[PDB]
Antibody, heavy 219, light 212 residues
Framework: QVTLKESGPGILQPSQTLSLTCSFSGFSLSTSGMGLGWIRQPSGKGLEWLTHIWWDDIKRYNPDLRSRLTISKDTSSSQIFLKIASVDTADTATYYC???????????????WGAGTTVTVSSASTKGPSVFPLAPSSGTAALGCLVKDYFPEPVTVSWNSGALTSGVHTFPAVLQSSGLYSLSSVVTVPSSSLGTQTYICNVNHKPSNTKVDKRVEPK | DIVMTQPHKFMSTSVEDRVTITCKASQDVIFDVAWYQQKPGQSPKLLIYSASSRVSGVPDRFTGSGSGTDFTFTISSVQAEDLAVYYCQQHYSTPYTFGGGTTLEIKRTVAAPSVFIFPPSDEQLKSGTASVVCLLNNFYPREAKYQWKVDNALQSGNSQESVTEQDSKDSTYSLSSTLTLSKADYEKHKVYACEVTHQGLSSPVTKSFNRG
């Protein structure tokens, strides 16, 4: 019945200080053999331990980042906190709060993990996407939408307002050197549909409160 | 400082099969190694610690073994929900370090990529940029090779790609590449081509267009 819930600021600019909070129930950070700490994961990458704090206030830190990390507990409200100073784009990641425990042989394994909070570090401004058609050429046809130059993640893409789902691939976004994301969403359809069926990609970019509905037709 | 190495980013299995994932430590870590499972969209989940001790409630088909620098993780009969990323971790000494992960994928009949090329739209060209898109659709296995050729000249450094997760219904992958040129550079050339090779392809497949 252990629960950990991370909260953070979502988006930051380079050189700002990231402050994260983890609220926990279902155990006391005061009982022995118990700790609480932070582990991050950049999108599509692996895991990096950052720091944890034990029930007796012993603090451990990743040495490559000790000069920027600070961890602290407040038992009085069942919470721990992480500061990461002067962030840069490399600190973009999902940040998980995780309970570390001590066993009789060994210890430093994490037996409960929170759902994570996502942090993007960027000097980019919030910006809805431009949506360009990927027009079916002239069996099976493919068409799609290039969803370009937006910030931040995520966008969602549906087709014909949710009616078209089979054959849809909405690809992971890539980060362009401009600092803006770009992604494509494609769908394969019967060629015999191209003159009669209407195809519209519905792009939702909640960070900018933007919806784009773009009809894709042969050229 | 201690490097955990999982030699395979991907491993292929079939349901009910037996699969073993390995993990090599750069230094002796006694037998202080954990194993985490991470399903897409969710957070990691501890399955095994101290090399061989299972977590309460974790299904008995999961097993771990090893000592020193060599550790293994075994699934007795891969169930469909076991398709996920698996990470080892040494918990012998700070700093605690994770392996690069191993993605467990499902084997299926070879399917060649369906290739499509998309010229840039007029709407985008009016704004100053040209994005050319190559799609490689519904293929298996995951390893596929593509090349951008502009006027039969190899393009390098001006395209980004991404790949979907293995499809949950037909177990295929798809790949999307965007080549991005200035409207100026786009106009300097005639034939835009994407050329694909793959285990399912007897001979390379090329899709191309002529600008305008």
């Amino acid at each position: 019945q252990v629960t950990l819930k991370e909260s953070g600021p979502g988006i930051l600019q380079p050189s700002q200080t990231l402050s994260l909070t983890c609220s926990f129930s279902g155990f006391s950070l005061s009982t022995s053999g118990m700790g609480l700490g932070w582990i991050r994961q950049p999108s599509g990458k692996g895991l990096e331990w950052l720091t944890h704090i034990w029930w007796d206030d012993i603090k451990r830190y990743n040495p490559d980042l000790r000069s920027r990390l600070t961890i602290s507990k407040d038992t009085s409200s069942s919470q721990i906190f992480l500061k990461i100073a002067s962030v840069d784009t490399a600190d973009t990641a999902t940040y998980y709060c995780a309970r570390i425990v001590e066993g009789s042989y060994s210890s430093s394994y994490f037996d409960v993990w929170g759902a994570g909070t996502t942090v993007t570090v960027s000097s980019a401004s919030t910006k809805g996407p431009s949506v360009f058609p990927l027009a079916p050429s002239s069996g099976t046809a493919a068409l799609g939408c290039l969803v370009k130059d937006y910030f931040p993640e995520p966008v969602t893409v549906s087709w014909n307002s949710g009616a078209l789902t089979s054959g849809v691939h909405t690809f992971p976004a890539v980060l362009q050197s401009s600092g803006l994301y770009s992604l494509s969403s494609v769908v394969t359809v019967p060629s015999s549909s191209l003159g009669t069926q209407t195809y519209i990609c519905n792009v939702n970019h909640k960070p900018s409160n933007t919806k784009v509905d773009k009809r894709v037709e042969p050229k | 400082d201690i490097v955990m190495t999982q030699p395979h980013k991907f491993m292929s299995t079939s349901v009910e099969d037996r699969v073993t994932i390995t993990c090599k430590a750069s230094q002796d870590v006694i037998f202080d190694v954990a194993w985490y499972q991470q399903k897409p969209g969710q957070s990691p989940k501890l399955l095994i610690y101290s090399a061989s001790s299972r977590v309460s409630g974790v299904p008995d088909r999961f097993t771990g073994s090893g000592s020193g620098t060599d550790f293994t993780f075994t699934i007795s009969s891969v169930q469909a929900e076991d398709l996920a990323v698996y990470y080892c971790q040494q918990h012998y000494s700070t700093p605690y370090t994770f392996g690069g992960g191993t993605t467990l994928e499902i084997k299926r009949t070879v399917a060649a990529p369906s290739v499509f090329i998309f010229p840039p739209s007029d709407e985008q060209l009016k704004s100053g940029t040209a994005s050319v898109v190559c799609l490689l659709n519904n293929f298996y296995p995951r390893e596929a090779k593509y090349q951008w050729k502009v006027d039969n000249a190899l393009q390098s450094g001006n395209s980004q790609e991404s790949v979907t997760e293995q499809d949950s219904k037909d177990s295929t992958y798809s790949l999307s590449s965007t080549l991005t040129l200035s409207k100026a550079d786009y106009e300097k050339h005639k034939v835009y081509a994407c050329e694909v090779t793959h285990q399912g392809l007897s001979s390379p497949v090329t899709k191309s267009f002529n600008r305008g």
